[PDB]
Design a protein around this nucleic acid. Sequence first.
RNA 1: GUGGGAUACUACCCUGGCUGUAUGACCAUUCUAACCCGCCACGCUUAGCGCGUGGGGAGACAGUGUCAGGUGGGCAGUUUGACUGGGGCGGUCGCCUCCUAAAGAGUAACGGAGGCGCCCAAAGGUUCCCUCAGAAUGGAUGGAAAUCAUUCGCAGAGUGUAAAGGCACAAGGGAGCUUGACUGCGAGACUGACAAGUCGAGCAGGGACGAAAGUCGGGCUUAGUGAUCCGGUGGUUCCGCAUG
RNA 2: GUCCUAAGGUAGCGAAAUUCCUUGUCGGGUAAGUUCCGACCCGCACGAAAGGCGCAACGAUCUGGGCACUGUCUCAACGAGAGACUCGGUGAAAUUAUAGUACCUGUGAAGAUGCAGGUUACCCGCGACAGGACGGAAAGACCCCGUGGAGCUUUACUGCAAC
RNA 3: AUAGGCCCAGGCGACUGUUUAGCAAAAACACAGGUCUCUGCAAAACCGUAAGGUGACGUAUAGGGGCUGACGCCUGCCCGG
RNA 4: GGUUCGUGGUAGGAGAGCGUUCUAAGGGCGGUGAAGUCAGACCGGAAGGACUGGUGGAGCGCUUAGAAGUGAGAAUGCCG
RNA 5: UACUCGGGAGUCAGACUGCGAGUGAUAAGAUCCGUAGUCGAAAGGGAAACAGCCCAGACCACCAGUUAAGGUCCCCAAAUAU
RNA 6: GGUAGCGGAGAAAUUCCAAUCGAACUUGGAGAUAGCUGGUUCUCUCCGAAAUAGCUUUAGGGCUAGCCUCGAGGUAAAGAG
RNA 7: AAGUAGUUAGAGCCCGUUAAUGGGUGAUAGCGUGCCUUUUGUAGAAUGAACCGGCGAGUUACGAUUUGUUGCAAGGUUAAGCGGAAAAAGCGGAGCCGUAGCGAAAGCGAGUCUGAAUAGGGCGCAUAAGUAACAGGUCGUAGACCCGAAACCAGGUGAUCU
RNA 8: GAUCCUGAGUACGGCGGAACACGUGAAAUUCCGUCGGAAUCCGGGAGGACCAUCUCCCAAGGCUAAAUACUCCCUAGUGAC
RNA 9: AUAGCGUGAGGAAGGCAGACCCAGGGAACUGAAACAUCUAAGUACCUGGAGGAAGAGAAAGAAAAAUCGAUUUCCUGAGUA
Lengths: 73, 97, 63
Amino acid sequence: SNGRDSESKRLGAKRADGQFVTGGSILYRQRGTKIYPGTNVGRGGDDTLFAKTDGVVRFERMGRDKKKVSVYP
Amino acid sequence: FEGGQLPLFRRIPKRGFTNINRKEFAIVNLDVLNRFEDGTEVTPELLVETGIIRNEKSGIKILSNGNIEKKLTVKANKFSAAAKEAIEAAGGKTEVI
Amino acid sequence: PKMKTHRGSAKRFKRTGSGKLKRRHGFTSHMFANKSQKQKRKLRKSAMVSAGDFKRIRQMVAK
RNA sequence: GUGGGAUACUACCCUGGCUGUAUGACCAUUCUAACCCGCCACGCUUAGCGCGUGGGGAGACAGUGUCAGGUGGGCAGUUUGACUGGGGCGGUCGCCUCCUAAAGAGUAACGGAGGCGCCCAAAGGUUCCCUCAGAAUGGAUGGAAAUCAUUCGCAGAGUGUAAAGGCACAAGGGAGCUUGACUGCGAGACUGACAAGUCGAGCAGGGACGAAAGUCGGGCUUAGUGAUCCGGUGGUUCCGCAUG
RNA sequence: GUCCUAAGGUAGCGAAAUUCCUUGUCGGGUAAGUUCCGACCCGCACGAAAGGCGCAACGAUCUGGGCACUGUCUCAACGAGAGACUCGGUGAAAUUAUAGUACCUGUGAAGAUGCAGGUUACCCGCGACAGGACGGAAAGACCCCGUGGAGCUUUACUGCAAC
RNA sequence: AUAGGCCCAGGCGACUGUUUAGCAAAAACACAGGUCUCUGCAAAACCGUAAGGUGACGUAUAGGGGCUGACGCCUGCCCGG
RNA sequence: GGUUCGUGGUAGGAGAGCGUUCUAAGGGCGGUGAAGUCAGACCGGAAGGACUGGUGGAGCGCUUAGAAGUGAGAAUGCCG
RNA sequence: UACUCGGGAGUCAGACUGCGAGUGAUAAGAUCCGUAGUCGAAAGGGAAACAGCCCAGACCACCAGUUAAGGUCCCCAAAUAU
RNA sequence: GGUAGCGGAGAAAUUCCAAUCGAACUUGGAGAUAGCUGGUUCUCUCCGAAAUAGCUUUAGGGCUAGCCUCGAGGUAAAGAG
RNA sequence: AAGUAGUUAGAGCCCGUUAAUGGGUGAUAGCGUGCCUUUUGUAGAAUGAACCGGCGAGUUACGAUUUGUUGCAAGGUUAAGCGGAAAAAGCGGAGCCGUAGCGAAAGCGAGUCUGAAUAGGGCGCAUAAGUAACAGGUCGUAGACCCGAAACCAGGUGAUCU
RNA sequence: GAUCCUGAGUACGGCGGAACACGUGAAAUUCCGUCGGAAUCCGGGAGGACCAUCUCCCAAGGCUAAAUACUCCCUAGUGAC
RNA sequence: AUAGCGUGAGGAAGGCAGACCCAGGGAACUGAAACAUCUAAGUACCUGGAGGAAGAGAAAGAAAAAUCGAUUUCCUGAGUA
Ligand SMILES: [K+]
Ligand SMILES: [K+]
Ligand SMILES: [K+]
Ligand SMILES: [K+]
Ligand SMILES: [K+]
Ligand SMILES: [K+]
Ligand SMILES: [K+]
Ligand SMILES: [K+]
Ligand SMILES: [Mg+2]
Ligand SMILES: [Mg+2]
Ligand SMILES: [Mg+2]
Ligand SMILES: [Mg+2]
Ligand SMILES: [Mg+2]
Ligand SMILES: [Mg+2]
Ligand SMILES: [Mg+2]
Ligand SMILES: [Mg+2]
Ligand SMILES: [Mg+2]
Ligand SMILES: [Mg+2]
Ligand SMILES: [Mg+2]
Ligand SMILES: [Mg+2]
Ligand SMILES: [Mg+2]
Ligand SMILES: [Mg+2]
Ligand SMILES: [Mg+2]
Ligand SMILES: [Mg+2]
Ligand SMILES: [Mg+2]
Ligand SMILES: [Mg+2]
Ligand SMILES: [Mg+2]
Ligand SMILES: [Mg+2]
Ligand SMILES: [Mg+2]
Ligand SMILES: [Mg+2]
Ligand SMILES: [Mg+2]
Ligand SMILES: [Mg+2]
Ligand SMILES: [Mg+2]
Ligand SMILES: [Mg+2]
Ligand SMILES: [Mg+2]
Ligand SMILES: [Mg+2]
Ligand SMILES: [Mg+2]
Ligand SMILES: [Mg+2]
Ligand SMILES: [Mg+2]
Ligand SMILES: [Mg+2]
Ligand SMILES: [Mg+2]
Ligand SMILES: [Mg+2]
Ligand SMILES: [Mg+2]
Ligand SMILES: [Mg+2]
Ligand SMILES: [Mg+2]
Ligand SMILES: [Mg+2]
Ligand SMILES: [Mg+2]
Ligand SMILES: [Mg+2]
Ligand SMILES: [Mg+2]
Ligand SMILES: [Mg+2]
Ligand SMILES: [Mg+2]
């Protein structure tokens, strides 16, 4: 009848604001853009936000109902 | 053994073949050849007599790891390009046995 | 008497100059339609036997 | 003239049918000298064994050996799952999604709900264009509700498919051009016992779209899958047990 | 009448060594009868050589009833002898962590001689009883487990003889 | 002193006999009888590698196997598997 | 030799040692009494070691190294 | 203190208590996770006795002291206290 | 006196084959194998767990990791509050 | 008068020692549920042991790996064997390890493989210490720590019971 | 060196099995059973299927010490038994 | 005539050392964490032959740009192929 679940996928954040981060690092795993990609940041096929250059993470607001993440050296 | 879990070796593939006419050669560098006074002749027999070598496995091969400072005539089975260059650049000469 | 080498391990591992052990990847026989090309271009490479597994198997392929 | 083709006759053929020959198989009947006789007479021999001799009988069969197919519990060696509020029945066993899960992650139960083992040659890539549901009326078939006009409308729609997250400055809808649903790889990260899985800027090659910027290494994202071993196919400036 | 069948159970017997419901119902027997005898037939699920139905004699067979007989009993009494008991001789065993080895209530690995708190209790024995020592004996035979075993079966698998 | 308790009714097995030495004596086995089946004699069946034997020093009114289980009245239909 | 922090402990890790049998070497006691055994109120932080006396009546310690049949309270242990 | 490398293990039956949730009956000394603690592997004081609660961590000796929980009429140390 | 264990004998019960029989007794392979239970002998000193994840013809076993210990390292001292 | 039988306090009585804040006994008072095993947890109404004494369980060979020590050091070392006291040297360098790795291999070589690449990346070198022997730890093959099955197979003995 | 001899129901092959480290595997080599069945010196075999070339060698007959293994025994002796 | 029979000349028969080896025949337990190929293992065991040793053995060989010259045993190769 019942009793099956799936393996959890370790979503969420993986680096902190103020944390230096090397390029290619994963910053936020997600489904969809619960966090949009920002400056020096991409979004992968599975919607993961990763850094493109070496820098320092920063979470920042877009307009009210949305957020992004950026990387600034 | 892993408890009936499939062992590592059974979960990965075999690879390759051993050649039967394989040739492995005793590896001589340049650093040893500084031991000899210039203008002389080096040979396999000499290199064995001096105990640098014991096994002429399938031949001798002289590799350019390091440097010579001395003019020499050398003869062996195979040389590396770079070691040939260095031997010549010191005014040496090379023969292929 | 002397120890017998594990032959199924000899046929598929390989040593390095650090004494470590090299292997090949292992989802690489017969279902490549269900494997992305990103996956296959990596599985065609080699790999290093891990530390935990080496600690287990080293004494079978000491020679 | 007909017709693809011509008629006479001649020869070389072909297709069958019959006679005759010559070869060569299968099967049957007979014979007898192999083999067999738990038939008789004699002898070795005071022997119901055996053997020999002479008859009689079967006879190329039997029996024996080698090989092969079948039948074969007559006999044999073994197999005949785990979780589990005891075991068993029933159910489940792998992958995805929510809740539980206590605002990072993770987190159990025979805990509560559902899905998967695909599909799409456009349902991909790009370039350009626009925007839904539903209601209010007005209207010929036409009606609660088809299509149309106006107004309202942040999404109450749709997102190939379950759900969650997310999306209207598209990821939703059309059109054109196409095949990046490419080759080599990949600093670095995620995850993680291992095996594996995941993301990846960027470099090179050669291309698609677009004026260009630039995007494109499948699809809004997350399931759509299975080790080695063994075989098969194609390819290869690899090896090839003295040399070719 | 119609479907299916290879064909649809005949006789005889039947709440049965078979009948669940079911102490079936009716009758008889008994003061009273889940048993008993005889009939009935909705035979859960009889049935014709896995033989059907019946049957004299037989039976340390099973079953029900009766006459007689009785200490089976109401409900026990007496007697005899053999042990038991005392004397003399001789002289084992199972068992056993050490032991100066009470009761109630409670606590406690949830059922205490031994802990707590209370209550009883002078020392040593003899004959008797067996509530407890979760008493002794027998590494539970029930149960489950073990990638344990043997024996048997077969249209499990693989084989072997034999034909 | 030694020396049957009897009767009525019923189920089962006809009977006498045999049986789990050391828990079961029975309604189980056997039994005579019935039936099927096979077997032409170097019978079939059995033991054994074979020789050799039993069968049987027999010969289908005999021998082996299966089933039933005295006697009486009977034993029905189905050959698709 | 001092200062500071510490010094409960099962599985288990690490270290330092006690003791037994034998060997080699060195050096010893022992019929004026060895090992062993019996008793003691001694010694050392522990495993353990001395001393005295009795019984015994012929071998035994110490030191440094080495080698092991190395230390029992349980195995429904085995024998007595 | 952490990390890295290497040698060597043992463990993979967990228990209660408090807090948050499930199953359960908003039962269980039930069961299953998360969290912290104690037991396990922890003696000692208090809960009469008491693994698992409260206080609190034993190197050794001492006929010394102050304190915790809990207590101060007697058993029973300390108030018949204000 | 005969029949002897991959066997024999069975009026058939798993009955009997020397107080043993769903396959005798003895000897050997054999110190079978046992993820099972039991047991495993002297002392002190320092440190000191776990009863979890994942996989497992797997669930009272094992393997890797997490947790302990010992040793050595290395510093842009990274740990803890 | 109960009490895992002792301990701590302790009188009285009796002795006099390896002489030291001694010995033996202990009225009485306090506290106190054996040892082992296995367990979440056992005084355990769970297991084992009557007692006493003896015997009785991680060892040896060969190999792998690591630590420590010693000797030589880009070298190190010999095996069988000759020799000889069941010796010690000497001889014996065949071979083994290391010194160069990469690659399926050809092969190239401080580089190599992949690849079209001169790119990047993997493994290596840069970034150089091993070796022989001893001892300790552990692992493997051997019974491998000790004891213990029911059963299987092979050769034989048995029908004096039945 | 005219000529002649040089191990025939073998050597090989098929089938079925086995031994060689080699489990039919591409399976050389050796052996057993059964079928078939050579050339024989311008000949024949092997070199891990097989073919050619090259090289090495003469089967289907027999003998052969020493070095190796073991110790019921004898003699003398040894043991960190 | 052979069979057969008789006589004479030789020869064998049997035992062990629970050892070593040659052949014939040939297990299972076990391991693979089941199990059947496979392993254990050509082991244990039966039997036959022996001899002080046996067996093997004087290339129809091993090999490869170079040759070596009967067998056996040991070290290595190598836990390689
Ligand atoms: K009826
Ligand atoms: K009693
Ligand atoms: K003495
Ligand atoms: K007997
Ligand atoms: K590189
Ligand atoms: K072959
Ligand atoms: K040759
Ligand atoms: K010989
Ligand atoms: Mg995608
Ligand atoms: Mg499995
Ligand atoms: Mg069977
Ligand atoms: Mg078996
Ligand atoms: Mg189960
Ligand atoms: Mg969370
Ligand atoms: Mg070739
Ligand atoms: Mg009755
Ligand atoms: Mg009929
Ligand atoms: Mg009778
Ligand atoms: Mg009495
Ligand atoms: Mg038991
Ligand atoms: Mg009768
Ligand atoms: Mg009886
Ligand atoms: Mg009886
Ligand atoms: Mg009859
Ligand atoms: Mg016959
Ligand atoms: Mg009958
Ligand atoms: Mg301590
Ligand atoms: Mg001992
Ligand atoms: Mg509980
Ligand atoms: Mg809790
Ligand atoms: Mg424990
Ligand atoms: Mg406490
Ligand atoms: Mg108390
Ligand atoms: Mg306790
Ligand atoms: Mg402390
Ligand atoms: Mg005070
Ligand atoms: Mg007071
Ligand atoms: Mg029965
Ligand atoms: Mg064995
Ligand atoms: Mg045993
Ligand atoms: Mg500590
Ligand atoms: Mg008791
Ligand atoms: Mg006991
Ligand atoms: Mg004892
Ligand atoms: Mg006999
Ligand atoms: Mg040939
Ligand atoms: Mg063949
Ligand atoms: Mg073989
Ligand atoms: Mg042949
Ligand atoms: Mg060849
Ligand atoms: Mg097995």
